[PDB]
Structure formats: C-alpha cells, structure tokens
Amino acid sequence: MLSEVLLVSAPGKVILHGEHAVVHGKVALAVALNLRTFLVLRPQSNGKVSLNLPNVGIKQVWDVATLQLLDTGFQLEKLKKVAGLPRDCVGNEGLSLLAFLYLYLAICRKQRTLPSLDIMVWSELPPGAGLGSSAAYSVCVAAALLTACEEVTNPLKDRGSIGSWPEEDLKSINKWAYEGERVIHGNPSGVDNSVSTWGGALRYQQGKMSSLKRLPALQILLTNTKVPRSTKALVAGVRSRLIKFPEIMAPLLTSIDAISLECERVLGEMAAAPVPEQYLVLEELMDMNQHHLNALGVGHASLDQLCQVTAAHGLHSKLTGAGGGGCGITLLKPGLERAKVEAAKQALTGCGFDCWETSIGAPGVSMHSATSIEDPVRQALGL
C-alpha cells in the first residue's frame, strides 16, 4: 500500500477514420484525444472511502467497517446484483460508483484491510459526445488503485515530473479498466479503454486491435455541435441503406476501408520526417471520408455547417464517431496563421458550438506530480 497522494490522467478517443465501416468489417483508426480525465487519490486516516465527481456534482461515501464485512466472492457476472445492495444509490453516473466500488473491492481485496481513500475525478472531456470519457475514467481509476495497492509499479518512484507504467503494467491497468467498462457498458469492445491506456493510435477491424507503432504530432480542433443524436439510430440507418443499395454501398464501404488503410500508411511515413505535402494527403483523406460518411447518410446540417465555416478559413474537417450531430475534427497543420484558426473558433462558437484546440495521438495513462498541473485542473481537483 502507498501513503502518497496519487494523480493520474487518461486521454479520450476519437475515430480518425473508419467510423461506421467497422461494423461491416472494415478497418478503423482510433486515436488518443488530449482532453484528459484527472483523478486524485488521497489516503485517509479515518475509515471511509469517498468518491467525488465535481462535474456530475455527486460525492458518495462508504465506511471501511461495513464494506469490510462483505461476503466477497471473486450470462453476466451476477456479483453485480450483490454489489447493488452492498451500496445504495443509483442513476446515470450511478453505474460509475458501481464500477468504482467494484474496482475498489476487487483490487484492494488482497489488502489485509480495506484502505480509507479519497478520490477526486475531473475531466476536460465533454460527456456524452462519444469521446470515450468513461473509459478514461475507468483507466484512471484502475491506474490509481493498482498503484496504491502497489499491484503495479509506481511511475513517480523517482520524484520525476511526469511518468508512465511499463508495458506489462499497462496491460494490467487495461485489463482492470475493461472490467469497469463492463459494469458500465456491459459489452464494450476494448477500444476506448485501450486507447485511454496506451494512447497514440489504434487499428481495429474485426475484434483485432494493434497500436500503430510510429505516429506524428497532430493538432486539431474538436467541435461539439451539442446536437443530440441516437447512435443506435444512425447505425441502423446505415444497415438499412446497405440492404437497400447493396452494389452502391458495398464499394463505398470498401472505399472507406481504403482511406483508413492509406492514412495508416501515410501516418507511418510522417513519423519519420513530416514533409508539408503529407499533410495535404491527410486533408484529402479527411475530405473524402467526410463525403463518404455523407453518402452513408450519417451526416447533419450542423456538420456540413462546421465543415463549411472551416473550409471558409482553409481548414479541413470531418465528423468523428456516430455523425448526425456530435463532434467534428478539424486538422491544423504546421504553418498556420492564427487569425485563420482564430476566426474559425469564433465562427464555430457563433454557431452555438463548443470548440477546443487540442491534439490527437495523445500519451495515455500518466502519473503527474501535483506540482506540474494547470491551475484550472489545480483549483478543480483541490491542489
């Protein structure tokens, strides 16, 4: 067990290419989004484990005593049924406390005595926009507990600035993160928590994942049209259009599959020396994938709008994820012109959108010294 205060953070995810085509067996590329989730673990002298989620403004508290006398025994792992009474509240983020409490017991079981902790979670990630926030959250929770119970090595065992876990350690964090995702999503594929853990880019096709080895630095603009949407609804639509127009749609999905592939190849060639001409290839891949998604019928007025304003300032974009609203990605290559992107952000904001100037192909589960944290995150977490 550790006595030190832990501060870990995991990034979000966004589909660069391959969004709807993955359901039909094509390749897709997911990448770490640098809108991180932060978690602060503070050991407690008292005997109560307390979880705090400022955003969803909720902070439940349990006492080691009670939990201590839990008949822990580690279709569907019914253990959840038990855990349901073992605690007491419910709601949207209700499964979040249920995922925690499950990570807590399951992980701190091997501990002679349940430790008294204090967790503070705050993310820059917009909830519900399909940016994988609950994976980043689970990854952050599994990382903090594992390190606390020293089930995994401690990246800041050198008092360094920022640190990460070694491969065999990361594999474990990701294994537990998947559990938490299972209690909250029941049937997650493992891409979200995988992206959140390893960071970078991830190839995904038919259950098979791979981390693109080399990946360049990508600056984008994340835009949330805040337009609600049904994921289930869009996928069904594509499924339909596919049944309705088989010979038109089959080749189209093959075309998207080729975009993800091409992109993957180009990215690997940029990881070497980022020639300016290679950014031109990506912008084109983004324009094309965006048109193909429109052909798939998953576009939206808010999205053609984001793209129209963006091209109005010379930037390229595409929706990311489900489409029909949600978020969009805008590439920002080297050799900008502040005024251009700056005019874009207000233009984008004028439409009633939320716009962030973040990056893609981000790090992954990271441990930070509470001294190398931004003031916003600082005041928020309580540092």
Added chain:
Amino acid sequence: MLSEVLLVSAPGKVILHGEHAVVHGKVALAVALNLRTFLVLRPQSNGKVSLNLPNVGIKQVWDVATLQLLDTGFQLEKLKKVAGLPRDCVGNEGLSLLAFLYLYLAICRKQRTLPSLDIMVWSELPPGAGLGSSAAYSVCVAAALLTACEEVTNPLKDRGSIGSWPEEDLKSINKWAYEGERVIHGNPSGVDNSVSTWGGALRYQQGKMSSLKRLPALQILLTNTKVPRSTKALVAGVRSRLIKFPEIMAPLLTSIDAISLECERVLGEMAAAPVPEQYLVLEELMDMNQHHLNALGVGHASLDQLCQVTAAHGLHSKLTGAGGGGCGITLLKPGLERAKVEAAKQALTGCGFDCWETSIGAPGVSMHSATSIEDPVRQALGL
C-alpha cells in the same frame, strides 16, 4: 424541295448520373433537357442563303451563284480546308457557319440547283454550360435541310400541331447532325446529338449507347452558377486522384457506376406507376452521386452553395457535367409547395445564379407549326 416555312426544335442534354465515371468505363445516363433550340427556315425567291444567329448577334449571307460553281467533292476530311476559302469569316461561332455551309452543300448537293433559304436560330439554352447546345443546333440544322430537300419525310404533312420523324428518318437526321458536330468538335462521341435527336434518356458506357425505353416525367430546376471552369482541368484532376489513390478511387467509381445502374432500373419502374416512394429513391441517388463527385474532387463552393440552399428548402441536388462550377440539377417531385421552390429560385438567384424551372427526359427533334409557339420565341424568331 419544299416551299413551306419550317420550324424545328431540339432539346439540350444533362448528365443525370455518371459524369466523370464514363471516362473510366462506367455507365452514365444522359437525358434530354427541355431548354430547346429553335430554327426557322424560310425559302427565298432571291439567290442568297442567309444564316442568322440573334444570340451571337451574327448573320452571314452567301449567294447561290458563287456557291453554285463550287468544285464540290463529297486523318481529317480535308474538305474543310477547301470549305474554309469557299466562305470567308471566322471566330468562336465561326465553325457554326462552317458546319451549316457544310450541311447545306453536302445535303442540298443532290438538288438540281442550290435553294435560296433564310435560317433563324434562337435557343433557350445557355451557351457554354455543357448543356450540349451545339448538338441541338446541328440537329436542328440537319432536320430543317433534310425535310426541306425532302430527303426525309415531313412531320407536318397533316397540318398537325406538333410532329416528329419516324425512326429511319431520325437515324438520318442524327447521322448528319454528327457531321456538323464533327466539324465543330472534331471528335464528338455522338451522345449530345443523339440525346438531341431521340430525346428521352440515353445509356452510355464504352462507346455503346442505348435509349432507355420507358421513362417518367421529371421536373427539375436547372441552375447555372455562371462560374467559369476548365473541363480538361477537372478530368485530369480525377485522373490524378485516381492514380494517387487507386484502392480508394476504384471502388468509388464502381459505386457511381452502381448509382447510374440503380437509377436506370428505378426509372423503368416509375414509367409504370410513379409511386411517391420512388421519388425518394432518386433524391437519395442524387444526394449520393453528389457526395461521390465531391469525393472525386470535382465539386465547388458555388455548387455546395446551390445544394445547401436547396436542401434548406427540402429539395435535392447534384452538379451535372464537369463540376467545378457550371450547372446543377434539382429534382422537383409531385406534391410540391410553390413557396418552397419559389423561395429556392430567388435564394438561388440571390447567389448571382441563373435558374430555370424546366424538365428532363424531353421530346427530341420536333417540327412545330409557327402558330403553336410561345410569344417570346415568336417575337425572337420573327413570327
């Protein structure tokens, strides 16, 4: 020879589907556009053949005497070299008088004596927008002369209202029309003059043409962004993008090919009983072909604009032809709402565009009684 005054008209053409994909062997559908070209032939007592083109404000005049003593002898048919001196002016529409004079001699040769005529040509077709105006013009010229020299039957031999030539007659008109197209375009495929002659819809793939047998009534909105463009330039671009991204582009062109095919099939099923749901299939085929053309890189701001305003009023559209400017097609199905299309036209006009509410799948070479002509065309032709 006839002494009566002749009034023939031929429609223009527009690619419903298949625009750039035809170069790469895919199927394409061309259809008669109801923006007609009118030609008025008046026999003359004097001895001078005079051609008048109000639009291009030019009206040359030759005298039978001179032409009479022409050593007529009927790589490249050098006969044109001769015909060049046999007459005297030159310019843009300079080959037009050269095509005429070539149709005139070549067709009226068998005439014991060159007849003295007076031709008046005026079209509702915008020149240079790729709507095949010179084919319609050639078709009109071949029709009028053939009928005059009675080399072909006379549709108004019954003093009827509107008439057309029988198949074997049309085939001839089209054969001569192709000659005139050859002198003006040197290497025409025969689609333009074919569409202008038979009217309706035309299937075209790899030199092989076919007339779709049954075809429904289609109401559209023709919009000319008046944005200049290089046809040679766009095709090369596609050729390039195709070389650059072979696996992405091949399937895309296969996808467009499937759209033209599907459409052809649907049209044939509408020729029966036009169920409202079938117009929904076309709008979708139009949305998809429009996105694919954007993927091909032949789109333009003026075109995304035409489509944006159009969808803003619930209508569907796609560029037609070269893209990168030029004209766009907007489908207008049964069960409109005047205000909708009406708001669209001004909206479209507001953008500085020329908008027509015409139709597609039009008639073809037709002979009209100078009494069943619109006043605009009336005052214009001099009737």
